[PDB]
């Protein structure tokens, strides 16, 4: 069986700017657990049909995961705008996959504030499809150079998420998982289409 539990039921997720990517291949893809789950707030697919994922076979499945705010989950989609889908995590216009997310306020919120999760709100260029920037170089907002020193119109690109105990789901932490699917032997398959690879001792 595919290792979805390793990425979905992980102890600690990464920041949106430093999104962790897993490679799911050569295994049975049980999408039943993903279907019959009332925990999942968002479950939207692009260029495919959620209801019929067991009726499909792909040669690679890149399972990207990270934490963002609830009001920023709408940005996680093809051809969008805003700090997240521009500086942190952008998808291609012709994207093929799904976007999963659930309110993780019970295990990513802290009384004093969870300062493990950050996000980049400053960038000279726009993040290319599936591009990742973990760099921490001083951003130039003004006309004059910074010279790697923080000052006027020159500041740190990263900003911490509050994630303090609040009542507003919009400003609460959400665990997002982007299952990006990919003329080659179809490795990750349904439980029926499985090309006798279920007994490979995955």
């Amino acid at each position, epitope marked *: 069986l595919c290792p979805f539990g390793e990425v979905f039921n992980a102890t*600690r997720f*990464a*920041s949106v*700017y*430093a999104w962790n990517r897993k490679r799911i291949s050569n295994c049975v893809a049980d999408y039943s657990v993903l279907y019959n789950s009332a925990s999942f707030s968002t479950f939207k697919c692009y260029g495919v049909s959620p209801t019929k994922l067991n009726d499909l076979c792909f040669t690679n499945v890149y399972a990207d995961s990270f934490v963002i705010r609830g009001d920023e989950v709408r940005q996680i989609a093809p051809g969008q705008t805003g*700090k997240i889908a521009d500086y942190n995590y952008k998808l291609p216009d012709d994207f093929t996959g799904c976007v999963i997310a659930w309110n993780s306020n019970n295990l990513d919120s*802290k009384v*004093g*504030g969870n*300062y*493990n999760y*950050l996000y980049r*709100l*400053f960038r000279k260029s726009n993040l290319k499809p599936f591009e990742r920037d*973990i760099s*921490t170089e001083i951003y130039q907002a003004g006309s004059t150079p910074c010279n790697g*020193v*923080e*000052g006027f119109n020159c*500041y*740190f690109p*990263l*900003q*911490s998420y*509050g994630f303090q105990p609040t009542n507003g789901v919009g400003y609460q932490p959400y665990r997002v998982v982007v299952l990006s699917f990919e003329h080659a032997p179809a490795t990750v398959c349904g439980p029926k289409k499985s090309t006798n690879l279920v007994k490979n001792k995955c």
Partner: nanobody
Amino acid sequence: QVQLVESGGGLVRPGGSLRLSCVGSGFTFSGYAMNWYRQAPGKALELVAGISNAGDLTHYEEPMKGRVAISRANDKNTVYLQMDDLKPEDTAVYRCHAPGVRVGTGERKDVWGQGAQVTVSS
């Protein structure tokens, strides 16, 4: 100006000890919490230790949980990080952090340090 000028660090041998210091100015240092991050070459900034406004509240993460101790001297407007039993994996740029300090500068409310190079080489 809202600034955090961190000092200390350098080169030590495996098992060696070091203390980093972060001095704060241009804001009430005792009014905001202090966090210690570290960035290893190639990896993303990870949280090491976090402390409270001026209280006895210290939170450590898995990375260095055991061989690190966070503390602050609000009288001297400074926060320290006592690192002992250092390993070669600890070789990284350690940064201080005070969240939600800046005001009237948009979502950019955090104030970040410059960075202190720590190298644990045999």
